[PDB]
Design an enzyme around this catalytic site. Structure first.
Site, PDB file in Angstrom:
ATOM      1  N   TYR A  80       0.536  69.427  33.451  1.00 33.69           N
ATOM      2  CA  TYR A  80       1.490  70.259  32.678  1.00 33.69           C
ATOM      3  C   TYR A  80       1.083  70.284  31.206  1.00 33.69           C
ATOM      4  CZ  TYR A  80       6.054  72.681  32.556  1.00 33.69           C
ATOM      5  OH  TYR A  80       7.087  73.575  32.469  1.00 33.69           O
ATOM      6  N   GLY A 121       9.032  70.871  27.490  1.00 37.06           N
ATOM      7  CA  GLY A 121       8.309  71.943  28.191  1.00 37.06           C
ATOM      8  C   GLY A 121       8.977  72.384  29.483  1.00 37.06           C
ATOM      9  N   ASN A 122      10.163  71.867  29.805  1.00 31.66           N
ATOM     10  CA  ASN A 122      10.900  72.200  31.054  1.00 31.66           C
ATOM     11  C   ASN A 122      11.336  73.672  31.038  1.00 31.66           C
ATOM     12  OD1 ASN A 122      14.123  72.131  30.389  1.00 31.66           O
ATOM     13  ND2 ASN A 122      12.951  70.722  29.085  1.00 31.66           N
ATOM     14  N   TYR A 123      11.258  74.334  32.186  1.00 31.07           N
ATOM     15  CA  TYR A 123      11.624  75.763  32.312  1.00 31.07           C
ATOM     16  C   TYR A 123      13.080  76.024  31.921  1.00 31.07           C
ATOM     17  CZ  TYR A 123       7.332  76.437  35.057  1.00 31.07           C
ATOM     18  OH  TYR A 123       6.054  76.534  35.489  1.00 31.07           O
ATOM     19  N   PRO A 143       0.340  90.107  30.856  1.00 27.15           N
ATOM     20  CA  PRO A 143       1.213  89.080  30.279  1.00 27.15           C
ATOM     21  C   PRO A 143       0.415  87.930  29.647  1.00 27.15           C
ATOM     22  CG  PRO A 143       2.158  89.894  32.311  1.00 27.15           C
ATOM     23  CD  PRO A 143       0.762  90.480  32.214  1.00 27.15           C
ATOM     24  N   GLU A 177       0.867  75.661  37.149  1.00 28.09           N
ATOM     25  CA  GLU A 177       1.442  75.835  38.507  1.00 28.09           C
ATOM     26  C   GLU A 177       0.349  76.341  39.451  1.00 28.09           C
ATOM     27  OE1 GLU A 177       4.098  74.310  38.942  1.00 28.09           O
ATOM     28  OE2 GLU A 177       5.550  74.678  37.323  1.00 28.09           O
ATOM     29  N   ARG A 180      -1.669  73.380  40.484  1.00 31.60           N
ATOM     30  CA  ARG A 180      -0.845  72.522  41.378  1.00 31.60           C
ATOM     31  C   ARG A 180      -0.749  73.094  42.794  1.00 31.60           C
ATOM     32  NH1 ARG A 180       4.552  71.501  37.844  1.00 31.60           N
ATOM     33  NH2 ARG A 180       3.840  69.733  36.563  1.00 31.60           N
ATOM     34  N   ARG A 196      -2.020  94.185  38.638  1.00 27.51           N
ATOM     35  CA  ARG A 196      -0.553  94.214  38.740  1.00 27.51           C
ATOM     36  C   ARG A 196       0.050  93.328  37.652  1.00 27.51           C
ATOM     37  NH1 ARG A 196       0.345  93.053  45.203  1.00 27.51           N
ATOM     38  NH2 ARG A 196      -0.422  95.054  46.018  1.00 27.51           N
TER      39      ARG A 196
END
Ligand SMILES: Cc1ccccc1-c1ccc(C(=O)O)s1
Length: 258
Positions: A80, A121-123, A143, A177, A180, A196
């Protein structure tokens, strides 16, 4: 000041392909899993305990079509993002404990300005700062291009906090992610293949949310058999239970130590 030198992996959105993105994620996984080894064909990331500071971090150097460069620092123990450098400033998420706070002092130590945010850093908090959930933040090469520019221009105040938080959510998912989960790497490869731009579906979001719980369930398992089932989501948001490691071997590429 001559800083500690960590391994660096380069990615550019400029001319990105399924191949260049695949090479990048495989290289990031490579340098994360040199420490610790395999359980049910799934590598376990190095334990926080006894890990020398000189082996604690890897760096991801991101460039874009605007020829702007930012360097993300990843903790090898959980894959992370802990912080980043853009020009003469480094920015760090609020560390969870005194140990992690000391560890991140060893990153970007020659940089003239160090900033530590009040938020981690948590969503949960990044989504509040961004003014959107992950399910309403588009991922893809476009993005990521924009996120790199946003992280770069925060160093001179050109980026507003909501756009910086949105940009962190994009980078964390397309790098951490994806490293992971082969499943999430696959989602990002598909976006790049088809040029896309789309938000992650509930299957991706629930995998991200469940990485810690899946890591623990797999490592504590009786030869793959979970003590308690784990609930995941399909693309349509419906829940199913997982009782065994088998179905997850193609899904999860790295686990945090239990
Ligand atoms: C998340 C996950 C883990 C293991 C095995 C399968 C799946 C699925 C992702 C999406 C799924 C649908 O849309 O059925 S099922």
């Amino acid at each position: 000041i001559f800083p500690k030198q960590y391994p660096i992996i380069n990615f550019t959105t400029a001319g990105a392909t399924v191949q260049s993105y695949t090479n990048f994620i495989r290289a990031v996984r490579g340098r994360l899993t040199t420490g610790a080894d395999v359980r049910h064909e799934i590598p376990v990331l190095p334990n926080r305990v006894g890990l020398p500071i000189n082996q604690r971090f890897i760096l991801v150097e991101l460039s874009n079509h605007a020829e702007l460069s930012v360097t993300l620092a990843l903790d090898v123990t959980n894959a992370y993002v802990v912080g980043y450098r853009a020009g003469n400033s480094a920015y760090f998420f609020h560390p969870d404990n005194q140990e992690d706070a000391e560890a991140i002092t060893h990153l970007f130590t020659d940089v003239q300005n160090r900033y530590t945010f009040a938020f981690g850093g948590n969503y949960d908090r990044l989504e509040q700062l961004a003014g959107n959930l992950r399910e309403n933040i588009e991922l893809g090469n476009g993005p990521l291009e924009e996120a790199i520019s946003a992280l770069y221009y925060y160093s001179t105040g050109g980026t507003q906090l909501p756009t910086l938080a949105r940009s962190f959510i994009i980078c964390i998912q397309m790098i951490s992610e994806a490293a992971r989960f082969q499943y999430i790497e696959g989602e990002m490869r598909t976006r790049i293949r088809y040029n896309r731009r789309s938000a992650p579906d509930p299957s991706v979001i629930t995998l991200e949310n469940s990485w810690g719980r899946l890591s623990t369930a797999i490592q504590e398992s009786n030869q793959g058999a979970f003590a308690s089932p784990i609930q995941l989501q399909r693309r349509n948001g419906s829940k199913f239970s997982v009782y065994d490691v088998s179905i997850l071997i193609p899904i999860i590429a790295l686990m945090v130590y239990r």
